[PDB]
Design a binder for these strands. Sequence first.
RNA 1: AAACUUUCAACAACGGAUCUCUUGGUUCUCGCAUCGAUGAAGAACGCAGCGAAAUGCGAUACGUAAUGUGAAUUGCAGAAUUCCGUGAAUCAUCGAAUCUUUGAACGCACAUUGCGCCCCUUGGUAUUCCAGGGGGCAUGCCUGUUUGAGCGUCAUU
Length: 236
Amino acid sequence: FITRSQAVRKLQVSLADFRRLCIFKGIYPRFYYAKDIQYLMHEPVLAKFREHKTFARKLTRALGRGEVSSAKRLEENRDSYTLDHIIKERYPSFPDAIRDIDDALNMLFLFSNLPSTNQVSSKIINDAQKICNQWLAYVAKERLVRKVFVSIKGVYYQANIKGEEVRWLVPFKFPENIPSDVDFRIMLTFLEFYSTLLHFVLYKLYTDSGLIYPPKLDLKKDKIISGLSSYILESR
RNA sequence: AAACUUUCAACAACGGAUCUCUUGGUUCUCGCAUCGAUGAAGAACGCAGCGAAAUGCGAUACGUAAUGUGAAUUGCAGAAUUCCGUGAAUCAUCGAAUCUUUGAACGCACAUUGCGCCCCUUGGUAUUCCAGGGGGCAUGCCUGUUUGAGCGUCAUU
């Protein structure tokens, strides 16, 4: 084993980006498994955080100068790191993915019922409400429900997504007092991890079992209720 | 007289002169530009069925692959080869290989076949550790690249 102080010095990335990467693989100290961190250092996501840092120096010298024309160029010619190649190492079999999607919707159904702050971007939120209603689109279509449970906390649900009894607590539609204690850096990175995870599954449930992914939306039903009656769906 | 000493002759000995030879040398002329951190020149340890030097070669070790030739190698022993063919040969050619320990010698060292470090790792559950396989870690300097440091300078309603 190695030390928590060692691995950041070893990886030479941000400690937050260590914590940000460590969520992605799923590495936990039993202490830090030394081969596994040596296993980590050859991984293409580690390419991007160095590049995302060296984007940031190259951009603040831009706007610091005042050439905003050149500053604007940097963004359009800027990649995003994908988390596809964090998934297939982690979710080998698709039926293993659906036994971890328990916690996934348990996060993501929370985030739709959130006010946008300085801490959380609304694009994430407006994806989350979109992904929820994308989730419920398939569930309400092919009638895949088994059990319900409304309680004090939220509303639990239960459904056999090819037989595994998923359970996802939809909270109640109210303003939610955002506590000062919580961290939307760690939780968002989970959402960041879970969001792309939820894309492929909905692609999988559509394009292998059901429909096309994603179906178009109906705007004018979304003007009324903005829920499940909108977002119309067709097989092909 | 014999023996002995000396002289000559004959036949043996001793020695290697002379003659003849010559895969060697020397000199002259002509042409060409071709060593080394991809690790040379040099030193050492080895390698063949049986070897001293020489020559060749590096655990693939008097060789391997390739191409041509077309049937030997031969001091001795012993194997071979379908010989109307992917093929004998210490053959020729030579472009692909391996290339021990060193040596400008380059992980740290002094004259330690010691002293290690990192990466990749197949095996002994290997989460502990143990062993094997493989590649690197010298100095200076250039072009970069990068994490920085610097009351070194300026900007800042």
